Design a binder for this molecule. Structure first.
Ligand code: LZM
Length: 290
């Protein structure tokens, strides 16, 4: 693209290469995404108007030469590297709470417009020096489906995937995003992924092992989902105090609601913003290494 000067490759999404680049007329540095169906162009252009302080701004959509490029605001780090970087000591809780609170704000906005992310994970949560956290690639899954490999044949992570998706539900809701964000929340607290599955059954069975094999008591209609099998092992549910120590009562309460099996029982973003866990939320600034 002639108006852009590629500074460096900085990623490789499900969708393709991500470059840091600098607008040749506007001086602007941006994230340049290389990704043509009529539908997909009409879906992306909706995304241009879906603006929020906790959503990485889509600056431009360039359709030229049957190539598609998306230009986003550039942020210098993602939550994955920040988490690796804070492995030895952990993210201080007040910072974890701030990030969760901002991310729920993002989702509450998106969801109010009936837009899902579908593929939340630490690598798509982008952090700045100001104590801000933003959701990247929002709305991209519906525009281009969610691949098993990346264009680089990289394996797409299952770790944050909701059970109803794993169980073959076609028509899933905004609750899928709540699940993922609860998995990330647990991960920030404990410094280990909650459910690090390396296939779909392994991901489903890691879920069942911590939370209990769902049944018709806790999840009405589960046994009639497309990929449910009566032969599932029946595992007992673990208590959360074992799952996420040393998270406090409020956090653990909030966490369990974000991880309800039944997508209709699972906490909404808007209702999670009201949880008393956030009573004393503040906005710390992280110490970063640019
Ligand atoms: N999409 C996107 C995006 C915006 N800023 N970024 C920095 C690093 C990696 N990806 C991005």
């Amino acid at each position: 693209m002639e108006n852009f000067q590629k500074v460096e490759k900085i990623g490789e999404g499900t969708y393709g290469v991500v470059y840091k680049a600098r607008n040749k007329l506007t001086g602007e540095v941006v994230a340049l995404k290389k990704i043509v169906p009529s539908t997909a162009i009409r879906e992306i252009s909706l995304l241009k108007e879906l603006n929020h302080p906790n959503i990485v701004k889509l600056l431009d959509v360039i359709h030229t030469e049957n190539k598609l490029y998306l230009v986003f605001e550039f942020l210098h780090q993602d939550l994955k590297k920040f988490m690796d970087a804070s492995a030895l000591t952990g993210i201080p809780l007040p910072l974890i709470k701030s990030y969760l609170f901002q991310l729920l704000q993002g989702l509450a906005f998106c969801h109010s417009h009936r837009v899902l992310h579908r593929d939340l994970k630490p690598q798509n949560l982008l952090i700045n020096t100001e104590g801000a956290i933003k959701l990247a690639d929002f709305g991209l899954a519906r525009a281009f489906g969610v691949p098993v490999r990346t264009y680089t044949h990289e394996v797409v992570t299952l770790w944050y995937r909701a059970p109803e998706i794993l169980l073959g539900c076609k028509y899933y809701s905004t609750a899928v995003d709540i699940w993922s964000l609860g998995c990330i929340f647990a991960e920030m607290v404990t410094r280990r992924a909650l459910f690090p599955g390396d296939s779909e059954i392994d991901q489903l069975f890691r879920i069942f092992r911590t939370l209990g094999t769902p049944d018709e008591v806790v999840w009405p209609g589960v046994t009639s989902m497309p990929d449910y099998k009566p032969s599932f092992p029946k595992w007992a549910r673990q208590d959360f105090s074992k799952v996420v120590p040393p998270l406090d009562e409020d956090g653990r309460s909030l966490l369990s609601q974000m991880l309800h099996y039944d997508p209709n029982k699972r906490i909404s973003a808007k209702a999670a913003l009201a949880h008393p866990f956030f009573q004393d939320v503040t906005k710390p600034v992280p110490h970063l290494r640019l």
